[PDB]
Design an enzyme around this catalytic site. Structure first.
Site, PDB file in Angstrom:
ATOM      1  N   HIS B  66       0.961  -0.995   0.076  1.00 53.18           N
ATOM      2  CA  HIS B  66       0.003  -0.022  -0.031  1.00 53.18           C
ATOM      3  C   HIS B  66       0.975   1.401  -0.019  1.00 53.18           C
ATOM      4  O   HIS B  66       2.012   1.341   0.709  1.00 53.18           O
ATOM      5  CB  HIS B  66      -1.049  -0.040   1.282  1.00 53.18           C
ATOM      6  CG  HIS B  66      -2.022  -0.864   1.026  1.00 53.18           C
ATOM      7  ND1 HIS B  66      -1.827  -2.363   1.306  1.00 53.18           N
ATOM      8  CD2 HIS B  66      -3.357  -0.762   0.879  1.00 53.18           C
ATOM      9  CE1 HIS B  66      -3.046  -2.797   1.218  1.00 53.18           C
ATOM     10  NE2 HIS B  66      -3.836  -2.022   1.022  1.00 53.18           N
ATOM     11  N   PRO B  67       0.450   2.334  -0.728  1.00 53.60           N
ATOM     12  CA  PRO B  67       1.067   3.426  -0.675  1.00 53.60           C
ATOM     13  C   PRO B  67       0.796   4.549   0.370  1.00 53.60           C
ATOM     14  O   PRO B  67      -0.299   4.365   1.179  1.00 53.60           O
ATOM     15  CB  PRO B  67       0.724   4.176  -2.156  1.00 53.60           C
ATOM     16  CG  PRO B  67      -0.564   3.823  -2.274  1.00 53.60           C
ATOM     17  CD  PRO B  67      -0.605   2.307  -1.698  1.00 53.60           C
ATOM     18  N   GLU B  86      -9.264   7.327  -3.466  1.00 51.80           N
ATOM     19  CA  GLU B  86      -9.474   7.007  -2.050  1.00 51.80           C
ATOM     20  C   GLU B  86      -8.615   8.288  -1.221  1.00 51.80           C
ATOM     21  O   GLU B  86      -9.139   8.840  -0.355  1.00 51.80           O
ATOM     22  CB  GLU B  86      -8.974   5.934  -1.481  1.00 51.80           C
ATOM     23  CG  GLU B  86      -9.893   4.620  -1.721  1.00 51.80           C
ATOM     24  CD  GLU B  86      -9.120   3.239  -2.066  1.00 51.80           C
ATOM     25  OE1 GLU B  86      -7.847   3.169  -1.837  1.00 51.80           O
ATOM     26  OE2 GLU B  86      -9.838   2.298  -2.612  1.00 51.80           O
ATOM     27  N   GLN B  87      -7.447   8.422  -1.582  1.00 55.97           N
ATOM     28  CA  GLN B  87      -6.765   9.557  -1.053  1.00 55.97           C
ATOM     29  C   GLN B  87      -7.518  11.197  -1.384  1.00 55.97           C
ATOM     30  O   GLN B  87      -7.374  11.686  -0.575  1.00 55.97           O
ATOM     31  CB  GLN B  87      -5.258   9.525  -1.219  1.00 55.97           C
ATOM     32  CG  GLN B  87      -4.778   8.148  -0.960  1.00 55.97           C
ATOM     33  CD  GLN B  87      -3.463   8.376  -0.786  1.00 55.97           C
ATOM     34  OE1 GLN B  87      -2.807   9.467  -0.632  1.00 55.97           O
ATOM     35  NE2 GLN B  87      -2.500   7.186  -0.848  1.00 55.97           N
ATOM     36  N   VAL B 119      -1.996   2.186   7.218  1.00 52.41           N
ATOM     37  CA  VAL B 119      -3.347   1.685   6.346  1.00 52.41           C
ATOM     38  C   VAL B 119      -4.506   2.009   6.936  1.00 52.41           C
ATOM     39  O   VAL B 119      -4.884   1.541   7.925  1.00 52.41           O
ATOM     40  CB  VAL B 119      -3.240   0.547   5.686  1.00 52.41           C
ATOM     41  CG1 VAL B 119      -4.497   0.018   5.138  1.00 52.41           C
ATOM     42  CG2 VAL B 119      -2.066   0.338   4.892  1.00 52.41           C
ATOM     43  N   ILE B 120      -5.375   2.825   6.452  1.00 50.34           N
ATOM     44  CA  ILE B 120      -6.743   2.979   7.047  1.00 50.34           C
ATOM     45  C   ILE B 120      -7.790   3.122   5.853  1.00 50.34           C
ATOM     46  O   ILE B 120      -7.393   3.475   4.773  1.00 50.34           O
ATOM     47  CB  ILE B 120      -6.670   4.480   7.671  1.00 50.34           C
ATOM     48  CG1 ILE B 120      -7.863   4.464   8.727  1.00 50.34           C
ATOM     49  CG2 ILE B 120      -6.672   5.791   6.840  1.00 50.34           C
ATOM     50  CD1 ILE B 120      -7.968   5.816   9.650  1.00 50.34           C
ATOM     51  N   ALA B 122      -9.661   4.801   3.703  1.00 47.33           N
ATOM     52  CA  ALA B 122      -9.698   6.421   3.377  1.00 47.33           C
ATOM     53  C   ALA B 122     -11.069   6.907   3.037  1.00 47.33           C
ATOM     54  O   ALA B 122     -11.396   8.290   2.990  1.00 47.33           O
ATOM     55  CB  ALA B 122      -8.588   6.873   2.399  1.00 47.33           C
TER      56      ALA B 122
HETATM   57  N1  LIG Z   1      -8.108   3.712   1.180  1.00 45.79           N
HETATM   58  C1  LIG Z   1      -6.904   3.722   1.291  1.00 45.79           C
HETATM   59  N2  LIG Z   1      -6.418   3.835   2.607  1.00 45.79           N
HETATM   60  C2  LIG Z   1      -5.202   3.946   2.651  1.00 45.79           C
HETATM   61  N3  LIG Z   1      -4.271   3.829   3.940  1.00 45.79           N
HETATM   62  C3  LIG Z   1      -2.997   3.942   3.362  1.00 45.79           C
HETATM   63  N4  LIG Z   1      -2.689   4.093   2.136  1.00 45.79           N
HETATM   64  C4  LIG Z   1      -4.001   4.120   1.642  1.00 45.79           C
HETATM   65  C5  LIG Z   1      -4.921   4.133   0.306  1.00 45.79           C
HETATM   66  O1  LIG Z   1      -4.119   4.253  -0.662  1.00 45.79           O
HETATM   67  N5  LIG Z   1      -6.137   4.094   0.367  1.00 45.79           N
END
Ligand SMILES: Nc1nc2[nH]cnc2c(=O)[nH]1
Ligand SMILES: Nc1nc2[nH]cnc2c(=O)[nH]1
EC number: 4.1.1.97
Lengths: 164, 165
Positions: B66-67, B86-87, B119-120, B122
């Site tokens: 995940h970024p 999402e971001q 990671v959440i 978003a």
């Molecule tokens: N939805 C979402 N939550 C994230 N949490 C960390 N990176 C991301 C992402 O790219 N999308």
């Protein structure tokens, strides 16, 4: 130099090793948890162990992430740099019209039978061996074929790792 | 239509669903083995069971795919189409210089502690919510945080699936 590898942040480790298993960066991302590594053989062993811990569906999934030999991606120039080098090396980029049709038919029969693409270590085989092996493995039972195919994946990965 | 989904060749199923878990087409590729799917819930259930069957390193690996929220890929315009949406929806695409720098620091602390990205889900959190979550979760033990993060991955996946629907 394994010392430099061992000091890599996970982001850089994933960028460096993220395609040693075709389109499966999760696998190389995972094994970073087992740092520090003794050597490249340690990394290799961890990847093999990880693949082996997977359910059969996981192994089939890895296979499904690989592009057909001489298929749509090769023809369209949309292979990953590794798959492109591998397929060129095995003669896939200079097939003639009849050979292209033949590979299509063979791939089609294989994937219909097994429900994943035909994978063979391209760098270890030439064009003629590829066709012979397609035809031979076409006769395997699914369980035996899954094992055979994953062994080829592991060979591809080892070569990819040693090319880095 | 689940009938249409069930009829897809694996190449097409992977094309369609290959990014419901960020940069993890392997997960969509694997679950196709279990077709026919009864419904969407069955698909999510198969995704959940697959992830749960991985060693802890596999779950960490997924997280590492995940970024970062507001990070290098966002700035370079190189996020996956889903990640960008999402971001952007979470307010990451209109942060000023200060904010961009602040996101960087909280993410640095988190990843140094846990060894994977924060990671959440978003699409379920705004700007402020994200910061509060980061600060609270920074306190968790690693064993617990892994479980917490993977739950978020499954939330993200669920919403990615619903967007396709
Ligand atoms: N939805 C979402 N939550 C994230 N949490 C960390 N990176 C991301 C992402 O790219 N999308
Ligand atoms: N080496 C190699 N073998 C394959 N078998 C099926 N596809 C491939 C590929 O891209 N590379």
């Amino acid at each position: 130099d394994i010392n430099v590898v061992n000091a890599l942040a996970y982001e850089d480790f994933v960028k460096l090793f993220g395609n040693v298993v075709e389109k499966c960066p999760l696998i190389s991302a995972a094994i970073w948890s087992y740092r520090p590594f003794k050597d490249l053989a340690d990394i290799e062993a961890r990847i093999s162990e990880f693949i082996h811990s997977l359910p059969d569906s996981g192994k089939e999934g890895i296979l499904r992430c690989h592009p057909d030999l001489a298929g749509r991606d090769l023809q369209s120039g949309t292979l990953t740099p590794e798959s492109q080098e591998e397929q060129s090396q095995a003669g896939m980029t200079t097939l003639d019209s009849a050979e292209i049709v033949h590979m299509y038919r063979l791939n089609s029969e294989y994937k219909e039978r097994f429900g994943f693409p035909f994978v063979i270590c391209a760098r270890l085989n030439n064009k003629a061996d590829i066709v012979r092996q397609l035809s031979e493995r076409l006769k395997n039972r699914r369980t035996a074929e899954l094992e055979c195919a994953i062994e080829e994946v592991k060979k591809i990965c080892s070569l990819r790792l040693h090319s880095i």
